[PDB]
């Protein structure tokens, strides 16, 4: 597994919002309605969300923009 | 409070001023002094004291 977490800390900086973003992605994946942007390898949603966030694709603004677009499209 | 200000200092006047300030605050608070002396005594909700 991903033993150490340093890339997510650098990608967030505050180190307290990174876990929040990871958990927000994980809960959304668990409930459904979302697709993993990164190629999954039969693992937990937490690890997949962490990898997607650290890949430079998920942020506190990307998720918010996507949610706003989805809400406005209704 | 005025009398404590009018008092001639020392520990007695200090205690008097403290009591006066405390009274002024408790008056500013909605604290009934009689509330310390209880009137109606609540008994336990029966599920608070197991048999």
């Amino acid at each position: 597994a991903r033993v150490t977490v340093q890339d997510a800390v650098e990608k967030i900086g505050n180190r307290f919002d990174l876990v929040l973003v990871a958990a927000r992605r994980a809960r959304q994946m668990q409930v459904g309605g979302k697709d993993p942007l990164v190629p999954e390898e039969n693992d937990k949603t937490t690890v997949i969300a962490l990898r997607e966030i650290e890949e430079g694709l998920i942020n506190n603004q990307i998720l918010d923009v996507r949610e706003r677009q989805e809400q406005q499209e209704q | 409070r005025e009398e404590l200000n009018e008092t001639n200092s020392e520990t007695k006047r200090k205690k008097l001023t403290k009591r006066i300030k405390l009274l002024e605050a408790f008056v500013q608070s909605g604290n009934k002094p009689e509330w310390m002396i209880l009137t109606v005594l609540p008994v336990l909700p029966p599920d608070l004291r197991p048999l």
Partner: protein, 49 residues
Amino acid sequence: VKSDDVNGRTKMYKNIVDGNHQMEPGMPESFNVLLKEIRSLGINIELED
């Protein structure tokens, strides 16, 4: 979860069955119990909003 929650225990067990992963804070029963203990002794227990 690892505390006295009863109605939260049931909700959490149901969620774990359903894979929801959510806990409901509410208010601890021991809090109301201590409030009563205050009301049990000579002081009213009243909590503002």
